[PDB]
């Protein structure tokens, strides 16, 4: 395992700035001195398939313009492409191309690391169980990972116990999980795009974080999965066409019919102005996750809007303004934005289908069509559901489809 000084870098400027010329290289490399090295676009630093290719151990290293290829795959010995030590504070990893079967950007114990504008193509043949993480972050405070392009890794941008960091504008395509969160209290992520993914956004046990403006295009079985998130903020997310499928490993999630949002034991969080579009389930609300501000979203095109297997009432409108529902057959007499009648998304016969799947054979029966009318006429048999007084009449998310 050689070092970065064992190459031939031509210095453009004498402020610890280096520039590697065009031409291929071989083997692992190690940065031990604060060198702000750039690269020409023909600098294909190709490892042989073992070890961490570009290990960084010095603080304030502005790695720029490299092109890494074929590093290791030993996930137990954590063979990354860009290994960044805890002593390597304020590292900048700008505009890089990566192709290899392990970790793309593994950082741990770092502060103010910047992972900007990279293209991390993971794998093609591995079964999405040993591909390694795209941008792995392990307990970092201050990080700024912005506008990268992760493709075909394992669980996308994995984040474990990292406190304060932003994830702005990065596109994540054909991976297992889009963005994975593990105990990342007081986090933030803006405008990310996840495409064709077995879970678009994994939000597991991370509190107080801001999830804003993110996009989930044609993901599989879980649009935004939130497990045990408290005091969070879900404003402006666009989750579109969550088809059914399975993750293949069933480690932290299970297989789903396609849920644009799955709320599991998340007590307090503001879920406003979102757009859950054309999935099988618009939102799944578990029984333990109750009394949180869910107002202003757009539930359009979903085959079933809310799944709420409970008998507790759940008002879904804070400050008198509710959500837009596509199947809301209501009117608006006094010309404000709100509807006049409340909207119950679930019947009693719409929750017998969740309890007993054999009622799907009886779902076209006239007696069910009688029982849908008996609930609309006799509200004593109506179980207390997930209604919202004053639902919206028009789309509030006129900007999120762009």
């Amino acid at each position: 395992a050689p070092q970065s000084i064992t190459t031939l870098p031509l210095q453009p400027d004498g402020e610890n700035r280096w520039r590697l010329p065009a031409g291929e290289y071989q083997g692992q490399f190690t940065i031990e001195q604060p060198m702000q090295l750039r690269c020409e676009p023909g600098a294909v630093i190709q490892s042989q398939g073992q070890g961490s290719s570009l290990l960084i151990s010095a603080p304030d290293v502005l790695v720029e313009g490299c092109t890494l290829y074929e590093w290791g795959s030993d996930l137990t010995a954590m063979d990354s492409a860009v290994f960044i030590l805890p002593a390597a504070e304020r590292a900048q990893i700008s505009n890089n191309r990566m192709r290899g079967p392990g970790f793309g950007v593994f950082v741990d114990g770092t502060r103010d690391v910047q992972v900007i504008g990279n293209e991390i193509d993971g794998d093609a043949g591995v079964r999405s169980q040993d591909r390694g993480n795209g941008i792995h972050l392990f307990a970092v405070s201050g990080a700024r990972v912005l506008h990268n392009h992760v493709r075909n890794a394992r669980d996308g941008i994995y984040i474990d116990t990292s406190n304060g960091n932003h994830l702005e504008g990065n596109v994540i395509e054909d991976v297992r999980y889009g963005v994975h969160y593990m105990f990342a209290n007081e986090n933030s992520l803006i405008d990310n795009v996840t495409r064709r993914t077995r879970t678009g956004y994994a939000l597991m046990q991370s509190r107080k974080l801001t999830v804003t403006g993110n996009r989930s295009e044609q993901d599989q079985n879980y649009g935004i999965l939130m497990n045990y998130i408290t005091y969070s903020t879900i404003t402006g997310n666009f989750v579109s066409d969550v088809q059914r499928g399975d993750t293949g490993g069933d480690s932290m999630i299970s297989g789903g019919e396609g849920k644009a949002l799955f709320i599991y034991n998340s007590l307090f969080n503001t879920i406003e102005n979102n757009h859950f579009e054309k999935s099988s389930l618009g939102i799944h609300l578990t029984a333990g996750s109750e009394d949180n501000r869910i107002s202003g979203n757009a539930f359009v095109g979903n085959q079933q809007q809310v799944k709420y297997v409970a008998s507790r009432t759940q008002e879904w409108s804070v400050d008198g303004r509710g959500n837009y529902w596509s199947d809301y057959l209501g009117w608006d007499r006094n010309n404000d934005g709100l509807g006049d009648i409340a909207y119950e998304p679930n019947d009693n016969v719409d929750r017998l289908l969740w309890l007993y799947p054999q009622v799907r054979l009886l779902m076209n029966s006239p007696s069910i069509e009688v029982l849908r009318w008996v609930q609309r006429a006799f509200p004593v048999i109506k179980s207390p559901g997930v209604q919202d007084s004053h639902p919206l009449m028009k789309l509030p998310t006129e900007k999120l489809l762009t």
């Binding site: 009117w331 007499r333 009648i341 409340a342 119950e344 004593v380 209604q387």
Partner: protein, 267 residues
């Protein structure tokens, strides 16, 4: 009096109708069952809006089962031409049938909402007995009036027709139009226009349907949630008080009984 002598017949002829006593016991076993489900769920505006919807489906049904063959059932039975050769008038053998069939509906709902009150005072512990007597007294003296409307509706469609098989088609037509078509015509007019057809005329169309004036009387104090009403959430836009809603229910009797008498006078 001659108005009571033919009322005493229909009081003793309607109570031998086995189709009446089936659907008047069905009104009793559902008003107990709704008031028990309104007791097991404890709400208060949901057990009023379901009882008022129960008497919307059944008190027009008992009224139209009674009186669809009141005039034409005597005309093709031969006993109407005989009755005019008795010392009577056409106004006495109609008002007498209205008094005779009206005391059945006054007894079919005193059985129904009487046991609905006894399935609350013996079920809900600590209920307000003053509020129970007033709310279910308002259910008793207004489901008769809804019943007396459809009783007087049935005299209109009996004097006009000349065959009892076509009177049963019109009585089924009146029961379908006023109960669950006018509630759906007004709903489809509100859905397809998104409440922008007329923001001031549309609550006044509830007064052209006596089942909607009946629902607006009982849901006066116990308004509650808006989705429990449906198209009766338009009644909050009505500036008329509750006493005028009693008077428009009585005017639906007297207009459709004077129409029932003017049709029967040229039978």
């Amino acid at each position: 009096n001659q108005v009571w002598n033919i009322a005493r017949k229909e009081l003793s002829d309607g109570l031998r109708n086995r189709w009446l006593l089936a659907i008047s016991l069905l009104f009793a076993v559902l008003a107990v069952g709704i008031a028990w489900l309104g007791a097991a769920a404890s709400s208060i505006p949901a057990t009023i809006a379901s009882l008022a919807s129960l008497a919307t489906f059944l008190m027009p049904l008992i009224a139209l089962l009674l009186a669809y063959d009141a005039i034409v059932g005597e005309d093709e039975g031969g006993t109407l031409m005989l009755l005019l050769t008795y010392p009577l008038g056409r106004g006495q053998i109609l008002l007498g049938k209205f008094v005779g069939h009206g005391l059945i509906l006054a007894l079919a709902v005193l059985i129904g909402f009487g046991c609905a009150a006894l399935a609350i005072a013996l079920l809900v512990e600590g209920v307000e007995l003053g509020m129970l007597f007033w709310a279910f007294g308002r259910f008793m003296i207004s489901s008769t009036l809804l019943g007396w409307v459809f009783l007087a509706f049935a005299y209109v469609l009996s004097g006009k027709v000349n065959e009892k098989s076509s009177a049963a088609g019109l009585a089924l037509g009146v029961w379908f139009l006023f109960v669950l078509v006018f509630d759906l015509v007004l709903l489809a007019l509100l859905v397809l226009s998104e409440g922008k057809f007329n923001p001031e005329l549309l609550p006044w169309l509830l007064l052209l349907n006596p089942t909607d004036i009946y629902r607006l009387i009982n849901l006066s104090g116990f308004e509650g949630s808006g989705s429990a009403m449906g198209v009766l959430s338009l009644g909050a836009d009505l500036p008329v008080p509750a006493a005028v809603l009693w008077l428009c229910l009585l005017a639906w009797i007297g207009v459709s009984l004077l129409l029932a008498y003017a049709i029967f006078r040229r039978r």
